[PDB]
Symmetry: C2
Subunit: 85 residues, 2 copies
């Protein structure tokens, strides 16, 4: 139990791409296959929390480490499961 619920861990994804693939395409994927996202290398990023949209950001590079700069945020209702002592 957390004395402070603000410490609660939220699952957050950074989505760099989305594509509709048909079963045949999926099925012919293998280690080594290259998927072209077709979008810029300093690309848009959707921030998701539990699969739901939180805002948008832009990939940036910092000393060989990848990061994201937040550009906009949106309001959204996050579900949390909390353990009572």
């Amino acid at each position: 139990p957390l004395t402070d619920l603000n410490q609660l861990p939220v699952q957050v994804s950074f989505e760099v791409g989305r594509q509709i693939l048909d079963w045949h395409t999926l099925t012919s994927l293998e280690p080594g296959s290259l998927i072209d996202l077709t979008t810029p290398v300093d690309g848009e990023v959707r921030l998701l929390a539990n699969g739901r949209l939180l805002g948008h950001g832009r990939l940036v590079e910092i000393q060989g480490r990848l990061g994201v700069r937040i550009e906009r945020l949106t309001e959204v209702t996050i579900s949390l499961e909390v353990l009572f002592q």
Copy 2:
């Protein structure tokens, strides 16, 4: 009028970086905020098929464009829907 199930669409998404921010961190987010994704500039990409983990890959930059090179595929049950005629 889909009569070949091998052509059924699947929504694939590509995700990079950590999957956990606490609430202090999410509530402090604003435009301009920077987030370290806890991965190198290449780094882990997760492939999701309709939101379920389908495999893992690496971000690559092919000719100024973002791509994903597949490294591994995981077994998973995908839910599809067809209109019978």
